Copies of this chain bind each other. A is one copy, B any other.
Amino acid sequence: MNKHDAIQLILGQFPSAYLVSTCGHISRDLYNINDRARNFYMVGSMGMAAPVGLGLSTVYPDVPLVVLDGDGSFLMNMGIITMIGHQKPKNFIHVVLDNGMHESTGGQRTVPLVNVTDIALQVGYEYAIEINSGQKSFDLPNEGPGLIHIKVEPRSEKIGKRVHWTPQEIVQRFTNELTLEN
């Protein structure tokens, strides 16, 4: 699987959820595939996707929320998982696009991410499913927190287009849709 198909899969499974994407090529690819007001692109501050997501799911617990992490972003601030397992937000979804490298940087090898599903289940995640290349779909429980491990092959497509939204515009649209939904 490539990142394009994985992002399209995640967007198809939850087309009515708010997403927080980590910095680098993941946010760029998400913005290029589908630009949504419910998408919060973190242009910088790597490793903060999951903390911001936990705060959002703390204030708005009923809303479904997806964190779009990579293997490098997940690993950099791994300890946050404990807090998530401690908070156990029922509608928190943790996606990890694992390509085994810092791709948005040049393809440098990351620390190998092993048995992510099991340790996710240990810290307090209600379910942690793994995805091999070619899985059409899967039915997931409506009660989280959840962890989705999608091992994606290195990209062959073009880098895409950088997100043109000013960070202030990103927070404006995100907050406005959050207020309009409830």
Contacts and interface: CB of A to CB of B under 8 A. Distances in A.
Interface of A: 75-79, 82-83, 85-86, 111-115, 118-119, 122-124
A76 B82 CA distance: 10
13 contacts: A76-B79, A77-B79, A78-B78, A82-B113, A85-B114, A86-B111, A86-B112, A86-B114, A114-B122, A114-B124, A115-B122, A118-B118, A119-B119
A128 to B, nearest CB: 11
A110 to B, nearest CB: 10
A114 B112 CA distance: 23
A125 to B, nearest CB: 11
